[PDB]
Amino acid sequence: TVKTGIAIGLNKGKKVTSMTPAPKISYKKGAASNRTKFVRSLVREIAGLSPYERRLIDLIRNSGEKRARKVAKKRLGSFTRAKAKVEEMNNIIAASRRH
Amino acid sequence: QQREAVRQLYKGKKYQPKDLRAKKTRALRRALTKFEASQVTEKQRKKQIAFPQRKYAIKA
Amino acid sequence: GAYKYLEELQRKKQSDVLRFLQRVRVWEYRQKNVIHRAARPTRPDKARRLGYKAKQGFVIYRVRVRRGNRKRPVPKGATYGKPTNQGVNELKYQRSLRATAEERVGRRAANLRVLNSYWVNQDSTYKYFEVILVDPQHKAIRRDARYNWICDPVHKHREARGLTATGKKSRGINKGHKFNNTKAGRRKTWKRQNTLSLWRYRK
Amino acid sequence: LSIRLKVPPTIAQFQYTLDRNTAAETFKLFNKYRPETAAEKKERLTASPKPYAVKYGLNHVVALIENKKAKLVLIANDVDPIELVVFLPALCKKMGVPYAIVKGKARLGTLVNQ
RNA sequence: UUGACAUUGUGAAG
RNA sequence: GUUCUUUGUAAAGUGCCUUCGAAGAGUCGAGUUGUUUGGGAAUGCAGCUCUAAGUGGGUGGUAAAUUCCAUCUAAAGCUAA
RNA sequence: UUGACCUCAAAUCAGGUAGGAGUACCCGCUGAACUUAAGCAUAUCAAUAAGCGGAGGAAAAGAAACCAACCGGGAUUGCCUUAGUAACGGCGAGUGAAGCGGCAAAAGCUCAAAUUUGAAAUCUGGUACCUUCGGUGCCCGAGUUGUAAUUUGGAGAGGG
Ligand SMILES: [Cl-]
Ligand SMILES: [Cl-]
Ligand SMILES: [Mg+2]
Ligand SMILES: [Mg+2]
Ligand SMILES: [Mg+2]
Ligand SMILES: [Mg+2]
Ligand SMILES: [Mg+2]
Ligand SMILES: [Mg+2]
Ligand SMILES: [Mg+2]
Ligand SMILES: [Mg+2]
Ligand SMILES: [Mg+2]
Ligand SMILES: [Mg+2]
Ligand SMILES: [Mg+2]
Ligand SMILES: [Mg+2]
Ligand SMILES: [Mg+2]
Ligand SMILES: [Mg+2]
Ligand SMILES: [Mg+2]
Ligand SMILES: [Mg+2]
Ligand SMILES: [Mg+2]
């Protein structure tokens, strides 16, 4: 990550003696904690599953995980959120009846 | 004389007739008192005592 | 404590348990008046994170507001203007239904100050809200350092001027290039950009 | 209305309450550990044995259950914001703390001077 | 005026 | 500047080891309709529909898939010139 | 029978509070047309006038879910500039910001989310007295469906 010392190119810019700033605690805002993991797991057992999550599980078993992502994209927003949701359903399927 | 006599009857008591109370203005009578406006939390008063504004000069 | 569990459970609004709870409660609210006093918060966890405290001087009110667009109130749909201003039906109010809820509660209890409000329920006709109110005259408030700022006369009818949390969102009061029109106030910014500035020695 | 509609199991579990016989025995044991009153608070303040008393408070009790320190938990069956108490049977079951759904939040308050 | 979605749950059959 | 009260087995700051480090939901975001902006595959605002996550989330002025990087920490609050 | 709890009422109950005026400047809502385009409908006039709601001596904004792509800057507001520029526009008539740079003024912060649990440690009111913008004692009440102390991401907390 050292600059070349010239005005153009991949690593353009002046070369200065580098320092490592101390990490900022605000950069860990979305980090799971032991207390938070316990509450979320307990709530899932109590509340159960959403109606759109029930039909996603059926599509995974009957029509594969590719069509599940297409439906999950529709109910949710971005396609990147559909990837995570389908992944969670697969873990639920593994721990529901497979094992 | 009559109004002065009534003031002795209500001396010290926390409630007085509205005609014997200070007039000022409507807004001034609704403002926070000196005691209420100066209230601070226990957290803030510890900071004020520990790190007050210091007096200093640029001499040497 | 238990507030953490309430926060997580409130997010599963289409679970079996919460679907049952919302059906019973929405019926109960519909049987009461449009505006009525609430004995206690329905969501104590939500109230705390909005500033509510369980002490004398804090009041909770529940209010029901009609849903949908704002039909333009013109006689027989006639606008008397150019075609670009001829629309009647598909027009939208610039303030949210949550803002309307706070304002009507504010007029009902004019001796109080609106602090915040939150969503509770909704049906096809109505949305339901609970509004948090603080009594500026009560001595438990005036003698409290963390809350006596509300007693300042500059905070009278915060909801009417859009100074609450929902009011500032509708005003577009946020930082960044996406809020250039409304960062410091839309009308204030427009005045600055449309003012001719002349100095004694002309530049 | 709440009886005409189907009730989910998480809420329906609160219709079962401890019967009159052992509930009386339960309150008989709990009445022997009443918290100190304000009157005898003054006497102690004006050097003391370790106290034994009933623990109360929703936040306080939940923390005790999560730390496996509670030996018996009594749960009221008539909390109008039912979300406050609905998760306790599962939390106690997960942590292995025995629990009983008892009838009357007013009766529980009587033994804690509330 | 017509269709779709929401309000919107419960049981059986073709 | 002087003077009366010791506040207090009170309060605050600073070194090193170890275990942890709770951070805001019909909300973010998405589609659509209307309005608005210099903001142009859509700047903000609002209605309706859908509705999240926790090494997450927002932004990085051309829509999309894949791989990186940078930068902050929303959905709660106060404050003189 | 008797005594609680919850919810909902009543009183010329004890103590308070809101309305109206003013409105130059300030925070929002609602909202035109004359006019310009040598006609005219998008556009323009204008996110203006009129209408409605709400404040103060200032208001509002404000301690980043910012700007940047640099050797990085560092709450907000205002002036000089950027700039009649990037961009928008029957791409016609017209419209039109922002980052950096100099300067004026400078100020920082706190709640929610943790068991005080070897002791609700908190608070309104009443009453008596007193050094009366308040203080102390005592008695009801509020409050565990959470009032204090302690900790707000720059951190910070429990032990040694
Ligand atoms: Cl477009
Ligand atoms: Cl808050
Ligand atoms: Mg940061
Ligand atoms: Mg408009
Ligand atoms: Mg274009
Ligand atoms: Mg584009
Ligand atoms: Mg403010
Ligand atoms: Mg009276
Ligand atoms: Mg304005
Ligand atoms: Mg013309
Ligand atoms: Mg002409
Ligand atoms: Mg003409
Ligand atoms: Mg006007
Ligand atoms: Mg005045
Ligand atoms: Mg000034
Ligand atoms: Mg102000
Ligand atoms: Mg910050
Ligand atoms: Mg700045
Ligand atoms: Mg314009």
mmCIF file with all atom_site columns, N, CA and C (backbone and C1' of nucleotides) in Angstrom, chain G residues 89-104:
data_model
loop_
_atom_site.group_PDB
_atom_site.id
_atom_site.type_symbol
_atom_site.label_atom_id
_atom_site.label_alt_id
_atom_site.label_comp_id
_atom_site.label_asym_id
_atom_site.label_entity_id
_atom_site.label_seq_id
_atom_site.pdbx_PDB_ins_code
_atom_site.Cartn_x
_atom_site.Cartn_y
_atom_site.Cartn_z
_atom_site.occupancy
_atom_site.B_iso_or_equiv
_atom_site.pdbx_formal_charge
_atom_site.auth_seq_id
_atom_site.auth_comp_id
_atom_site.auth_asym_id
_atom_site.auth_atom_id
_atom_site.pdbx_PDB_model_num
ATOM 1   P P     . G G 1 89  ? -34.460 17.329 -18.811 1.00 0.00 ? 89  G G P     1
ATOM 2   O "O5'" . G G 1 89  ? -34.976 18.688 -19.465 1.00 0.00 ? 89  G G "O5'" 1
ATOM 3   C "C5'" . G G 1 89  ? -36.100 19.369 -18.925 1.00 0.00 ? 89  G G "C5'" 1
ATOM 4   C "C4'" . G G 1 89  ? -36.354 20.683 -19.620 1.00 0.00 ? 89  G G "C4'" 1
ATOM 5   C "C3'" . G G 1 89  ? -36.450 20.634 -21.132 1.00 0.00 ? 89  G G "C3'" 1
ATOM 6   O "O3'" . G G 1 89  ? -37.716 20.179 -21.570 1.00 0.00 ? 89  G G "O3'" 1
ATOM 7   C "C1'" . G G 1 89  ? -35.157 22.508 -20.454 1.00 0.00 ? 89  G G "C1'" 1
ATOM 8   P P     . G G 1 90  ? -37.844 19.206 -22.836 1.00 0.00 ? 90  G G P     1
ATOM 9   O "O5'" . G G 1 90  ? -39.172 19.703 -23.552 1.00 0.00 ? 90  G G "O5'" 1
ATOM 10  C "C5'" . G G 1 90  ? -39.215 20.929 -24.266 1.00 0.00 ? 90  G G "C5'" 1
ATOM 11  C "C4'" . G G 1 90  ? -39.995 20.758 -25.543 1.00 0.00 ? 90  G G "C4'" 1
ATOM 12  C "C3'" . G G 1 90  ? -39.248 21.009 -26.839 1.00 0.00 ? 90  G G "C3'" 1
ATOM 13  O "O3'" . G G 1 90  ? -38.393 19.935 -27.194 1.00 0.00 ? 90  G G "O3'" 1
ATOM 14  C "C1'" . G G 1 90  ? -41.414 21.963 -26.948 1.00 0.00 ? 90  G G "C1'" 1
ATOM 15  P P     . C G 1 91  ? -37.118 20.181 -28.141 1.00 0.00 ? 91  C G P     1
ATOM 16  O "O5'" . C G 1 91  ? -36.334 21.387 -27.455 1.00 0.00 ? 91  C G "O5'" 1
ATOM 17  C "C5'" . C G 1 91  ? -35.624 21.201 -26.234 1.00 0.00 ? 91  C G "C5'" 1
ATOM 18  C "C4'" . C G 1 91  ? -34.327 21.972 -26.208 1.00 0.00 ? 91  C G "C4'" 1
ATOM 19  C "C3'" . C G 1 91  ? -33.318 21.578 -27.282 1.00 0.00 ? 91  C G "C3'" 1
ATOM 20  O "O3'" . C G 1 91  ? -32.494 22.706 -27.577 1.00 0.00 ? 91  C G "O3'" 1
ATOM 21  C "C1'" . C G 1 91  ? -32.411 21.114 -25.159 1.00 0.00 ? 91  C G "C1'" 1
ATOM 22  P P     . G G 1 92  ? -32.584 23.449 -29.000 1.00 0.00 ? 92  G G P     1
ATOM 23  O "O5'" . G G 1 92  ? -33.796 24.471 -28.838 1.00 0.00 ? 92  G G "O5'" 1
ATOM 24  C "C5'" . G G 1 92  ? -33.747 25.543 -27.907 1.00 0.00 ? 92  G G "C5'" 1
ATOM 25  C "C4'" . G G 1 92  ? -34.955 26.437 -28.044 1.00 0.00 ? 92  G G "C4'" 1
ATOM 26  C "C3'" . G G 1 92  ? -35.033 27.619 -27.090 1.00 0.00 ? 92  G G "C3'" 1
ATOM 27  O "O3'" . G G 1 92  ? -34.263 28.724 -27.535 1.00 0.00 ? 92  G G "O3'" 1
ATOM 28  C "C1'" . G G 1 92  ? -37.128 26.511 -27.177 1.00 0.00 ? 92  G G "C1'" 1
ATOM 29  P P     . A G 1 93  ? -33.532 29.692 -26.482 1.00 0.00 ? 93  A G P     1
ATOM 30  O "O5'" . A G 1 93  ? -34.728 30.438 -25.745 1.00 0.00 ? 93  A G "O5'" 1
ATOM 31  C "C5'" . A G 1 93  ? -35.540 31.383 -26.427 1.00 0.00 ? 93  A G "C5'" 1
ATOM 32  C "C4'" . A G 1 93  ? -36.708 31.803 -25.574 1.00 0.00 ? 93  A G "C4'" 1
ATOM 33  C "C3'" . A G 1 93  ? -36.359 32.257 -24.165 1.00 0.00 ? 93  A G "C3'" 1
ATOM 34  O "O3'" . A G 1 93  ? -35.950 33.613 -24.108 1.00 0.00 ? 93  A G "O3'" 1
ATOM 35  C "C1'" . A G 1 93  ? -38.101 30.674 -24.059 1.00 0.00 ? 93  A G "C1'" 1
ATOM 36  P P     . G G 1 94  ? -34.784 34.064 -23.101 1.00 0.00 ? 94  G G P     1
ATOM 37  O "O5'" . G G 1 94  ? -35.462 33.960 -21.664 1.00 0.00 ? 94  G G "O5'" 1
ATOM 38  C "C5'" . G G 1 94  ? -34.741 33.461 -20.549 1.00 0.00 ? 94  G G "C5'" 1
ATOM 39  C "C4'" . G G 1 94  ? -35.524 32.399 -19.821 1.00 0.00 ? 94  G G "C4'" 1
ATOM 40  C "C3'" . G G 1 94  ? -34.885 31.849 -18.556 1.00 0.00 ? 94  G G "C3'" 1
ATOM 41  O "O3'" . G G 1 94  ? -35.072 32.677 -17.421 1.00 0.00 ? 94  G G "O3'" 1
ATOM 42  C "C1'" . G G 1 94  ? -35.581 30.054 -19.900 1.00 0.00 ? 94  G G "C1'" 1
ATOM 43  P P     . U G 1 95  ? -33.861 32.926 -16.393 1.00 0.00 ? 95  U G P     1
ATOM 44  O "O5'" . U G 1 95  ? -33.809 31.596 -15.517 1.00 0.00 ? 95  U G "O5'" 1
ATOM 45  C "C5'" . U G 1 95  ? -34.976 31.085 -14.893 1.00 0.00 ? 95  U G "C5'" 1
ATOM 46  C "C4'" . U G 1 95  ? -34.849 29.614 -14.584 1.00 0.00 ? 95  U G "C4'" 1
ATOM 47  C "C3'" . U G 1 95  ? -33.789 29.230 -13.563 1.00 0.00 ? 95  U G "C3'" 1
ATOM 48  O "O3'" . U G 1 95  ? -34.214 29.426 -12.224 1.00 0.00 ? 95  U G "O3'" 1
ATOM 49  C "C1'" . U G 1 95  ? -33.664 27.772 -15.423 1.00 0.00 ? 95  U G "C1'" 1
ATOM 50  P P     . G G 1 96  ? -33.186 29.982 -11.123 1.00 0.00 ? 96  G G P     1
ATOM 51  O "O5'" . G G 1 96  ? -32.055 28.864 -11.044 1.00 0.00 ? 96  G G "O5'" 1
ATOM 52  C "C5'" . G G 1 96  ? -32.330 27.564 -10.541 1.00 0.00 ? 96  G G "C5'" 1
ATOM 53  C "C4'" . G G 1 96  ? -31.096 26.700 -10.567 1.00 0.00 ? 96  G G "C4'" 1
ATOM 54  C "C3'" . G G 1 96  ? -29.836 27.347 -10.013 1.00 0.00 ? 96  G G "C3'" 1
ATOM 55  O "O3'" . G G 1 96  ? -29.765 27.290 -8.602  1.00 0.00 ? 96  G G "O3'" 1
ATOM 56  C "C1'" . G G 1 96  ? -29.351 26.367 -12.101 1.00 0.00 ? 96  G G "C1'" 1
ATOM 57  P P     . A G 1 97  ? -29.087 28.486 -7.773  1.00 0.00 ? 97  A G P     1
ATOM 58  O "O5'" . A G 1 97  ? -27.624 27.948 -7.462  1.00 0.00 ? 97  A G "O5'" 1
ATOM 59  C "C5'" . A G 1 97  ? -27.273 27.512 -6.160  1.00 0.00 ? 97  A G "C5'" 1
ATOM 60  C "C4'" . A G 1 97  ? -27.518 26.036 -5.981  1.00 0.00 ? 97  A G "C4'" 1
ATOM 61  C "C3'" . A G 1 97  ? -26.459 25.288 -5.190  1.00 0.00 ? 97  A G "C3'" 1
ATOM 62  O "O3'" . A G 1 97  ? -26.619 25.425 -3.790  1.00 0.00 ? 97  A G "O3'" 1
ATOM 63  C "C1'" . A G 1 97  ? -26.943 24.093 -7.164  1.00 0.00 ? 97  A G "C1'" 1
ATOM 64  P P     . A G 1 98  ? -25.378 25.880 -2.883  1.00 0.00 ? 98  A G P     1
ATOM 65  O "O5'" . A G 1 98  ? -24.458 24.581 -2.815  1.00 0.00 ? 98  A G "O5'" 1
ATOM 66  C "C5'" . A G 1 98  ? -24.997 23.326 -2.430  1.00 0.00 ? 98  A G "C5'" 1
ATOM 67  C "C4'" . A G 1 98  ? -24.024 22.207 -2.695  1.00 0.00 ? 98  A G "C4'" 1
ATOM 68  C "C3'" . A G 1 98  ? -22.591 22.458 -2.259  1.00 0.00 ? 98  A G "C3'" 1
ATOM 69  O "O3'" . A G 1 98  ? -22.392 22.244 -0.873  1.00 0.00 ? 98  A G "O3'" 1
ATOM 70  C "C1'" . A G 1 98  ? -22.597 21.587 -4.450  1.00 0.00 ? 98  A G "C1'" 1
ATOM 71  P P     . G G 1 99  ? -21.187 22.980 -0.107  1.00 0.00 ? 99  G G P     1
ATOM 72  O "O5'" . G G 1 99  ? -19.906 22.115 -0.493  1.00 0.00 ? 99  G G "O5'" 1
ATOM 73  C "C5'" . G G 1 99  ? -19.837 20.739 -0.158  1.00 0.00 ? 99  G G "C5'" 1
ATOM 74  C "C4'" . G G 1 99  ? -18.546 20.107 -0.612  1.00 0.00 ? 99  G G "C4'" 1
ATOM 75  C "C3'" . G G 1 99  ? -17.272 20.902 -0.381  1.00 0.00 ? 99  G G "C3'" 1
ATOM 76  O "O3'" . G G 1 99  ? -16.824 20.856 0.961   1.00 0.00 ? 99  G G "O3'" 1
ATOM 77  C "C1'" . G G 1 99  ? -17.229 19.885 -2.527  1.00 0.00 ? 99  G G "C1'" 1
ATOM 78  P P     . C G 1 100 ? -16.205 22.166 1.658   1.00 0.00 ? 100 C G P     1
ATOM 79  O "O5'" . C G 1 100 ? -14.750 22.304 1.024   1.00 0.00 ? 100 C G "O5'" 1
ATOM 80  C "C5'" . C G 1 100 ? -13.804 21.248 1.097   1.00 0.00 ? 100 C G "C5'" 1
ATOM 81  C "C4'" . C G 1 100 ? -12.733 21.407 0.047   1.00 0.00 ? 100 C G "C4'" 1
ATOM 82  C "C3'" . C G 1 100 ? -11.809 22.605 0.212   1.00 0.00 ? 100 C G "C3'" 1
ATOM 83  O "O3'" . C G 1 100 ? -10.754 22.369 1.128   1.00 0.00 ? 100 C G "O3'" 1
ATOM 84  C "C1'" . C G 1 100 ? -12.581 22.511 -2.019  1.00 0.00 ? 100 C G "C1'" 1
ATOM 85  P P     . G G 1 101 ? -10.365 23.472 2.231   1.00 0.00 ? 101 G G P     1
ATOM 86  O "O5'" . G G 1 101 ? -10.054 24.785 1.382   1.00 0.00 ? 101 G G "O5'" 1
ATOM 87  C "C5'" . G G 1 101 ? -8.849  24.912 0.640   1.00 0.00 ? 101 G G "C5'" 1
ATOM 88  C "C4'" . G G 1 101 ? -8.678  26.308 0.092   1.00 0.00 ? 101 G G "C4'" 1
ATOM 89  C "C3'" . G G 1 101 ? -8.875  27.443 1.084   1.00 0.00 ? 101 G G "C3'" 1
ATOM 90  O "O3'" . G G 1 101 ? -7.739  27.683 1.897   1.00 0.00 ? 101 G G "O3'" 1
ATOM 91  C "C1'" . G G 1 101 ? -10.090 27.911 -0.878  1.00 0.00 ? 101 G G "C1'" 1
ATOM 92  P P     . G G 1 102 ? -7.924  28.230 3.397   1.00 0.00 ? 102 G G P     1
ATOM 93  O "O5'" . G G 1 102 ? -8.357  29.752 3.209   1.00 0.00 ? 102 G G "O5'" 1
ATOM 94  C "C5'" . G G 1 102 ? -7.404  30.745 2.859   1.00 0.00 ? 102 G G "C5'" 1
ATOM 95  C "C4'" . G G 1 102 ? -8.019  32.123 2.821   1.00 0.00 ? 102 G G "C4'" 1
ATOM 96  C "C3'" . G G 1 102 ? -8.680  32.613 4.102   1.00 0.00 ? 102 G G "C3'" 1
ATOM 97  O "O3'" . G G 1 102 ? -7.764  33.101 5.068   1.00 0.00 ? 102 G G "O3'" 1
ATOM 98  C "C1'" . G G 1 102 ? -10.122 33.018 2.288   1.00 0.00 ? 102 G G "C1'" 1
ATOM 99  P P     . C G 1 103 ? -8.064  32.913 6.638   1.00 0.00 ? 103 C G P     1
ATOM 100 O "O5'" . C G 1 103 ? -9.382  33.773 6.899   1.00 0.00 ? 103 C G "O5'" 1
ATOM 101 C "C5'" . C G 1 103 ? -9.337  35.192 6.892   1.00 0.00 ? 103 C G "C5'" 1
ATOM 102 C "C4'" . C G 1 103 ? -10.716 35.805 6.842   1.00 0.00 ? 103 C G "C4'" 1
ATOM 103 C "C3'" . C G 1 103 ? -11.552 35.719 8.109   1.00 0.00 ? 103 C G "C3'" 1
ATOM 104 O "O3'" . C G 1 103 ? -11.183 36.676 9.086   1.00 0.00 ? 103 C G "O3'" 1
ATOM 105 C "C1'" . C G 1 103 ? -12.889 35.173 6.237   1.00 0.00 ? 103 C G "C1'" 1
ATOM 106 P P     . A G 1 104 ? -11.336 36.340 10.651  1.00 0.00 ? 104 A G P     1
ATOM 107 O "O5'" . A G 1 104 ? -12.878 36.592 10.959  1.00 0.00 ? 104 A G "O5'" 1
ATOM 108 C "C5'" . A G 1 104 ? -13.441 37.895 10.890  1.00 0.00 ? 104 A G "C5'" 1
ATOM 109 C "C4'" . A G 1 104 ? -14.928 37.866 11.133  1.00 0.00 ? 104 A G "C4'" 1
ATOM 110 C "C3'" . A G 1 104 ? -15.382 37.235 12.442  1.00 0.00 ? 104 A G "C3'" 1
ATOM 111 O "O3'" . A G 1 104 ? -15.305 38.129 13.539  1.00 0.00 ? 104 A G "O3'" 1
ATOM 112 C "C1'" . A G 1 104 ? -16.673 36.368 10.661  1.00 0.00 ? 104 A G "C1'" 1
#
